[PDB]
Write a protein that binds this ligand. Structure first.
Ligand SMILES: Nc1ncnc2c1ncn2[C@@H]1O[C@H](COP(=O)(O)OP(=O)(O)OP(=O)(O)O)[C@@H](O)[C@H]1O
Ligand SMILES: Nc1ncnc2c1ncn2[C@@H]1O[C@H](COP(=O)(O)OP(=O)(O)O)[C@@H](O)[C@H]1O
Ligand SMILES: NCCC[C@@H](N)C(=O)OP(=O)(O)O
Ligand SMILES: [Mg+2]
Ligand SMILES: [Mg+2]
Length: 353
């Protein structure tokens, strides 16, 4: 049995912990927040700030098999970079790739440098899509029909938002499984489903990783627009939501693949269906779809229910949020599991949907 140390206990942390458990790994969480979201989900919890007490993390590195940064605190990421040679286990991260990926303008420059289509900057005709240069979870992302002079202003590209994860070992780049990102009125993601292979998107994703070169994990987000595929962002860190759908639909565990990239290396290149979604239990049991932004305001997050083809996680807080995971051999069976999972909420908690 191996042990993984996660630095950060919110949504990235949950995803990493979930897949680590599927891999039969013990999960050690480090987080500066005594109320860290997944503190009770991890097998062990150590509450400290790694910047203030690096010696504690370095000591932990002696008794775990890998350390995985799962936060987007730049101060933390840059500090870990400065001490990474001191760890007694691999640090599963690509710091240079993250530096490019975190800055959306820098990323777009990179896309252009290798001939990858991306939305036109500063269009003359509405609607415009605007977003901060360095946020995630769709924070500050809005459609416009005096922003910071550093705000990204783009043409609005209509169509499917599609995600691909790539794990690189520096030499080989394993492009995994296409997923559909279902957006809400805030452009946050409330649902994820798998998609058939897209050879063009796979090649683009491969080339984005290969030209770095990627040693770590990165996802690629593209919109399948009316005039073709346009890559909107890359994020060189462990993502939330999509890796669960990747796991059920393809059989590939992204935590195991990432761990392999830093130990044995990786090789390039199941077909089930999966529905992943968040639902808030509102006033009087009204079920409301919500995005990640809502889930990250929670106070406690862990497993609520399981049966064959159904996993339900409960995020406690101001109005409970359920994360529902359904899988089966095809859309029909998975839809049947979704109904059963919903009816559990209906009969148990008097939920309405
Ligand atoms: N230096 C650090 N040491 C320990 N844990 C950290 C550190 N920096 C961030 N974290 C933890 O990682 C988790 C995710 O952090 P991140 O900054 O990516 O999301 P956030 O929602 O902006 O965090 P916060 O809850 O602080 O606003 C948080 O629970 C945070 O407490
Ligand atoms: N140019 C664009 N046109 C239309 N929608 C966009 C555009 N850029 C981003 N979006 C939408 O906003 C969401 C968040 O933007 P993204 O660039 O993927 O940032 P993040 O770092 O926040 O996840 C996307 O998933 C997509 O739904
Ligand atoms: N692989 C798509 C996962 C999307 C999302 N949950 C995420 O973690 O990244 P952002 O686009 O920065 O919000
Ligand atoms: Mg992003
Ligand atoms: Mg994004």
């Amino acid at each position: 049995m191996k042990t993984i140390c996660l630095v950060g206990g919110k949504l990235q942390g949950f995803e990493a912990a979930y897949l680590s458990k599927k891999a039969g790994m013990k999960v050690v969480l480090v987080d500066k927040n005594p109320q860290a979201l997944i503190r009770n989900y991890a097998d062990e919890f150590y509450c400290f700030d790694v910047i203030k007490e690096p010696e504690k993390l370095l000591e932990l590195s002696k008794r775990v098999d890998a350390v995985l940064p799962v936060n987007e605190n730049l101060a933390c990421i840059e500090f870990l970079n400065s001490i990474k040679e001191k760890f007694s286990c691999p640090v599963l991260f690509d710091f240079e790739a993250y530096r490019i990926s975190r800055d959306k303008k820098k990323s777009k420059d990179y896309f252009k440098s290798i001939g990858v289509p991306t939305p036109q900057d500063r269009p003359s005709k509405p609607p415009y899509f605007v977003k901060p240069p360095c946020e995630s979870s769709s924070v500050g992302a809005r459609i416009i029909y005096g922003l910071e002079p550093d705000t990204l202003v783009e043409e609005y590209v209509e169509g499917e938002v599609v995600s691909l994860e790539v794990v690189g070992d520096g030499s080989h780049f394993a492009v995994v499984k296409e997923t559909l990102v279902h957006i809400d009125e805030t452009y946050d993601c409330h649902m994820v489903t798998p998609l058939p292979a897209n050879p063009l998107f796979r090649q683009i994703s491969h080339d984005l990783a290969a030209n770095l070169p990627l040693k770590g994990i990165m996802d690629v987000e593209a919109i399948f627009g009316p005039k073709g595929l346009r890559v909107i962002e890359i994020d060189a860190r462990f993502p939330s939501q999509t890796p669960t759908v990747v796991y059920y639909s393809s059989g590939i565990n992204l935590i195991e693949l990432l761990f392999r990239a830093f130990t044995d290396g990786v090789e390039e290149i199941e077909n089930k269906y999966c529905i992943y979604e968040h639902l808030m239990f509102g006033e009087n049991g009204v079920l409301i779809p919500v995005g990640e932004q809502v889930l990250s305001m929670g106070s406690d997050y862990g497993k609520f229910y399981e049966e064959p083809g159904i996993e339900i996680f409960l995020c406690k807080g101001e109005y409970p949020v359920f994360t529902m995971v359904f899988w089966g051999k095809d859309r029909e069976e998975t839809g049947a599991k979704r109904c059963k999972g919903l009816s559990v909420l209906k009969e148990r908690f008097g939920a309405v949907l």
